[PDB]
Amino acid sequence: ITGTSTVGVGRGVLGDQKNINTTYSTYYYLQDNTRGDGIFTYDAKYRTTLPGSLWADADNQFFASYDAPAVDAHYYAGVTYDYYKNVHNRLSYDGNNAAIRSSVHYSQGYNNAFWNGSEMVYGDGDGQTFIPLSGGIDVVAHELTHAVTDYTAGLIYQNESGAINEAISDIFGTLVEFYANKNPDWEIGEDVYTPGISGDSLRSMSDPAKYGDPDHYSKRYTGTQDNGGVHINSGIINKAAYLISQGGTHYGVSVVGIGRDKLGKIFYRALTQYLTPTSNFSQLRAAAVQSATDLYGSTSQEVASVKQAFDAVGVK
Ligand SMILES: [Ca+2]
Ligand SMILES: [Ca+2]
Ligand SMILES: [Ca+2]
Ligand SMILES: [Ca+2]
Ligand SMILES: [Zn+2]
8 A cells, every 4th residue: 555654563462562664554554664665464254265364553652452463474475575685685585576465363273374375364273272372483484484485595385395495484584583582492382382281393403303203304294295205204304404403313413513604594595595496304404514615614513514414314
């Protein structure tokens, strides 16, 4: 919509107060004109017809419980935008400042969030397994990273390339959580998962096996469920990325950690320069090695650490 850029205030899903960039034209809309060609948040009104209505508010105050998921979708979209721009010099997900659109209140008790090819979509959860999914910065950044992958490597969402596609989203979702720096960790979705249970999440990058996911290639899932295990076998790559960043000894193989910033550089470069739609795990290892070599040199610690991390998870 055409109007003036304004600044609203509200509460997110977890009760935290924050400012949001809005647009004024009769109503105050969730439209942030300060990043690229806009970040736009919509209300799906418990339906599944998308995108729904551009979120409109009478007073620019967003403190109703109904407002909370839209406050977070909008705000965390802006944080993720800032991360890709400031850290990777990437302008929005297509690299050309495409508008970022998100819809919240999708369906009823919908325990999930997803990129549909064109926009972000968040359920409210059923209140037991999930609260509104946009309350998790790692969930928002995970899903927006699928948009990034779709415009770059284009990793097919099945089998090994699919598990890489998932891992890449867990990695950058986690690096975005660290960038925002509020209670960061190496698990996925903990802020919005199971309000009655402390300390759990959907997945762990530091210990995939915590939730039944493989942490070594010899444990890969080779069946047909979950598109050949895209959310299962990502544990292998998640563990390798965790090792590259943090270090550790995993099945007897020692890895020297190089830190989060370098992990982010190596994997962003692999994603955007080397990976293709059909890349398998072994080809990811070669892309990450070639990335680390471009960035730090072939004799570098960074290159040696990438090789050790992939050895540790059984990927040759
Ligand atoms: Ca209001
Ligand atoms: Ca966290
Ligand atoms: Ca997390
Ligand atoms: Ca929980
Ligand atoms: Zn995903």
